[PDB]
Ligand binder design. Structure first.
Ligand SMILES: Nc1ncnc2c1ncn2[C@@H]1O[C@H](COP(=O)(O)OP(=O)(O)O)[C@@H](O)[C@H]1O
Ligand SMILES: Nc1ncnc2c1ncn2[C@@H]1O[C@H](COP(=O)(O)OP(=O)(O)O)[C@@H](O)[C@H]1O
Length: 203
């Protein structure tokens, strides 16, 4: 099974992807996590992607498409989490899969209002070492666990990221709807409730 998680930043896509991958045996492909590792290591990809990420812009398509070609699991179930982010990327994904006799089985759209998005992101805190994600209100980190607020989770960059999502990424909703594989998730609900719906639509 191949899944794509789609939705505004802060919808809880990474949270649900980690849970589902761990519990039901999927390989989790997070372009965000992979890019952040590239940046930390200072690879050619990391050094180029960094400035786009910092401004809240998308990293150029060719770089992301090559990344996916490099890391795509040959066998097994896969959750694509944060990819594709543009129509060009979605078309590239379809081509790659078609050549391998595969396809995207379900696209899950994590619906959540803008006001909730902003609250999700402004309260997001991460363990900079482990990448573990917390929220100051809805899932506070234990004391004596070092966390930070990511620079791209500050108000100005959040605004930019939502604009970029609406302009470049939201068209994928219609792209996948017309393939007949789109499923709607109410991602505004608490974590366990969202996870139950995730399990429902793929069962
Ligand atoms: N598929 C992609 N195409 C272009 N840029 C990406 C992609 N995935 C991640 N990025 C870059 O990494 C940043 C953070 O990505 P991600 O971790 O998926 O988002 P979020 O902050 O919503 O959890 C994005 O704002 C973008 O700059
Ligand atoms: N259902 C939920 N209710 C409240 N907070 C959530 C929920 N899901 C995730 N979060 C928190 O919201 C923020 C965004 O979650 P994340 O998984 O990083 O979103 P995305 O990957 O879609 O950008 C994180 O701080 C996370 O702890």
């Amino acid at each position: 099974m191949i899944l794509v998680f789609l939705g505004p930043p802060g919808a809880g896509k990474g949270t649900q992807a980690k849970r589902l991958a761990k519990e039901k045996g999927f390989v989790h492909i997070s372009t965000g996590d992979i890019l952040r590792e590239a940046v930390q290591k200072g690879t050619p990809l990391g050094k180029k992607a960094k400035e786009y990420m910092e401004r809240g812009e998308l990293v150029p398509d060719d770089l992301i498409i090559a990344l996916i070609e490099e890391v795509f699991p040959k066998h097994g179930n896969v959750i694509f989490d944060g990819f594709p982010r543009t129509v060009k990327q979605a078309e590239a994904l379809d081509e790659m899969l078609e050549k391998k006799g595969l396809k995207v089985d379900h696209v899950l759209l994590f619906e959540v209002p803008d006001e909730v998005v902003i609250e999700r992101l402004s309260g997001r805190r991460i363990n900079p070492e482990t990448g573990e994600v917390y929220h100051v209100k809805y899932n506070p980190p234990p004391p004596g666990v070092k966390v930070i607020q990511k620079e791209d989770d500050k108000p100005e960059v959040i605004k930019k990221r939502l604009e970029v999502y609406r302009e470049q990424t939201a068209p994928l909703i219609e792209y996948y709807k017309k393939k007949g594989i789109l499923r709607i998730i109410d991602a505004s609900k608490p974590v366990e409730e969202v996870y139950r719906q995730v399990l429902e639509v793929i069962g």
